[PDB]
Amino acid sequence: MPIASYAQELKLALHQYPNFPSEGILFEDFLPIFRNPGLFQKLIDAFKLHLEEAFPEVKIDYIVGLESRGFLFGPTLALALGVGFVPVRKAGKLPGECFKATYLFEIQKNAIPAGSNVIIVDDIIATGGSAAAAGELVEQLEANLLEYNFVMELDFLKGRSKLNAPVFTLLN
């Protein structure tokens, strides 16, 4: 499968950092994928192929990416798909009238029309709180949340239980 082979090669590119940011935490650094345009293209194509597989006759209108590491691939995935990108940002970073969701995250009220089909993207799901907030913001837009797309998922934290929409994680 094209997705599995790319998922394996991207897994190998990850760099493990014991005890960062603090004692006990194992940091999965996906940044090495972005320094190699071959690997980066594979990550984008992997997500693209999955969305083509999951949603063959459903038009995606936007990728919604979470600040800050979702910004590293979300916009690029959006452009690969030929769709818009919209950020979900931390509190007080977006100008103009915003909707708010507590975790505080925000989205711009004018960014996405009602009835738009949306995919939320982020590097990793841990507790799920940030992703859940993004979902609340998509809901306040009256937009449709087709799926959450993550690069990594910390299964032991049970982040997906806080979420309503279906979840895809590329590297399990």
Ligand X SMILES: O=P(O)(O)OC[C@@H]1N[C@@H](COP(=O)(O)O)[C@@H](O)[C@H]1O
Ligand Y SMILES: Nc1ncnc2[nH]cnc12
Binding to ligand Y by residue 26, rule CB under 6 A?
yes
Q: Rounded to an integer, what distance in angstroms lies between the CA atom of residue 112 and that of residue 118?
A: 9
Cα separations in angstroms, 77 against 93, 154, 157 = 23, 22, 27
Tokens 């090669």 sit at which residue? Answer: 9
Q: Helix and strand tally (H, E) in the chain?
A: 5, 9
Q: Contacting a copy of itself (CB under 8 A), which of 76, 130, 149, 169?
A: 76
Binding to ligand X by residue 135, rule CB under 6 A?
no
Q: Which of residues 79-138 bind ligand Y (CB under 6 A)?
A: 124, 126
Residue 126 annotated in ligand binding: yes
Per residue in 105-140, is it b (16+ CB within 10 Å) or e — as a string?
A: bbbbeebbeeebbbbbbbbbbbebbbbbbbbbbbee
Residue 128 annotated in ligand binding: yes
3-state secondary structure (DSSP) of residue 61 = coil
**Token digits of residue 120:** 């939320």
Q: Contacting ligand X (CB under 6 A), which of 46, 101, 159, 171?
A: 159
Residue 115 annotated in ligand binding: no
Q: Rounded to an integer, what distance in angstroms lies between the CA atom of residue 55 and that of residue 147?
A: 10
Residue 74 annotated in ligand binding: no
Binding to a copy of itself by residue 24, rule CB under 8 A?
no
Counting residues that bind a copy of itself (by CB under 8 A) gives 39
Binding to ligand Y by residue 27, rule CB under 6 A?
yes
Nearer to a copy of itself, 104 or 166 (CB): 104
Interface contacts to a copy of itself, rule CB under 8 A: 15, 17, 20-21, 27, 29, 31, 34-37, 40-41, 44, 62, 67-68, 71-73, 75-76, 78-79, 81-87, 92-96, 108, 111-112
Interface contacts to ligand X, rule CB under 6 A: 66, 69, 93, 122-131, 159
